[PDB]
Amino acid sequence: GADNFDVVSCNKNCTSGQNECPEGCFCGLLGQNKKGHCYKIIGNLSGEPPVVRR
Numbered sequence: 001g002a003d004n005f006d007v008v009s010c011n012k013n014c015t016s017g018q019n020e021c022p023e024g025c026f027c028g029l030l031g032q033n034k035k036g037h038c039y040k041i042i043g044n045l046s047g048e049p050p051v052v053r054r
Contacts, residue, residue, distance in 0.1 A: 010038035
């Protein structure tokens with residue numbers, strides 16, 4: 001089910017080697033760069049009605 005999951009931002013800068021990302025996120029780096037951003041994997045649940053009252 002790899003096609004069910006998307007990578008999204010976890011809204012934080014990070015550097016490799018330092019445990020800087022929140023749990024459940026990863027530090028995504030481009031190539032040999034030491035600095036990157038925190039990301040996370042999510043799956044969307046579809047089918048929600050257009051309006052929900054709580």
